[PDB]
Amino acid sequence: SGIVPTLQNIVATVTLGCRLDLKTVALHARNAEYNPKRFAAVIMRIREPKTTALIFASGKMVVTGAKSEDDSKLASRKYARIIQKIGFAAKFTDFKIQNIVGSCDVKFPIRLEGLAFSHGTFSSYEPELFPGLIYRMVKPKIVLLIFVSGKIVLTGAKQREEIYQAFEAIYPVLSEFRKM
DNA sequence: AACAGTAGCACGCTGTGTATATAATAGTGTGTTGTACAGCACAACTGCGC
């Protein structure tokens, strides 16, 4: 082994606590998009940490694109400050990470059909529909996308340890189904 | 007759469908409920006439 998964995307939610006028928000923000007809939220962005926020009239906000939990909270506080600077009585509350995505490379090809047959109740593999095997782990409850190349995607985690836990648990199985 | 330029065709590369999680919230679609409108031979009935 020796491989440890790399975090790729962190999704979080934040309650600003006050109602927002989206045209005002979009108008005053330096990096905003807002087309009511397409989606009901201002799509705001900041350069550091590089992230994207979906800002709603209710004052709720979704922050995505961060590569670390630190970066997620940091960028979230920053978006909240922007809203304040524009003039609303916003508050940075209820910061919570909802989804963590990770990925790695085991460095060997995998026999997906064998794995799907062996771990049938957790696996779903339809190569004509999507080339990767969808593995639904029980403990921890994580979803893994397994590819012939040996590249692995882990998602559905609320905490970093779950990403790490799942990979540790899957590695022996990937080894059992290697090609070379 | 030869050379240069322009147009057309073919090939290669980049971008967007499929799948995973996860939050946000008002809309859109579907289903259900309510209201309104549109071959014998003999056996029995029944029908007609006295």
UniProtKB/Swiss-Prot annotation:
An example Gene Ontology biological process: negative regulation of DNA-templated transcription
Signal sequence segment: none
Main subcellular localisation: nucleus
GO cellular component terms, semicolon-separated: nucleoplasm; nucleus; protein-containing complex; transcription factor TFIIA complex; transcription factor TFIID complex; transcription factor TFIIIB complex; transcription regulator complex
GO molecular-function terms, A-Z: chromatin binding; disordered domain specific binding; DNA binding, bending; DNA-binding transcription factor binding; RNA polymerase I general transcription initiation factor binding; RNA polymerase II core promoter sequence-specific DNA binding; RNA polymerase II general transcription initiation factor activity; RNA polymerase II-specific DNA-binding transcription factor binding
Key words of the record: DNA-binding, Nucleus, Repeat, Transcription
Cystine bridges: none
Sequence repeat residue numbers: 7-83, 97-174
Domain of life of the source: Eukaryota
Compartments reported by the entry: Nucleus
Similarity remark: Belongs to the TBP family.
Assembly information from the UniProt record: Binds DNA as monomer. The 1.2 MDa TFIID complex is composed of TATA binding protein (TBP) and the 14 TBP-associated factors. One copy of each TAF1, TAF2, TAF3, TAF7, TAF8, TAF11, TAF13, two copies of each TAF4, TAF5, TAF6, TAF9, TAF10, TAF12, and three copies of TAF14. Interacts with TFC8.
Described purpose of this protein according to its UniProt entry: General transcription factor that functions at the core of the DNA-binding general transcription factor complex TFIID. Binding of TFIID to a promoter (with or without TATA element) is the initial step in preinitiation complex (PIC) formation. TFIID plays a key role in the regulation of gene expression by RNA polymerase II through different activities such as transcription activator interaction, core promoter recognition and selectivity, TFIIA and TFIIB interaction, chromatin modification (histone acetylation by TAF1), facilitation of DNA opening and initiation of transcription.
Protein name: TATA-box-binding protein
Organism, as annotated: Saccharomyces cerevisiae (strain ATCC 204508 / S288c)
Residues included from the entire protein: 61 to 240 of 240
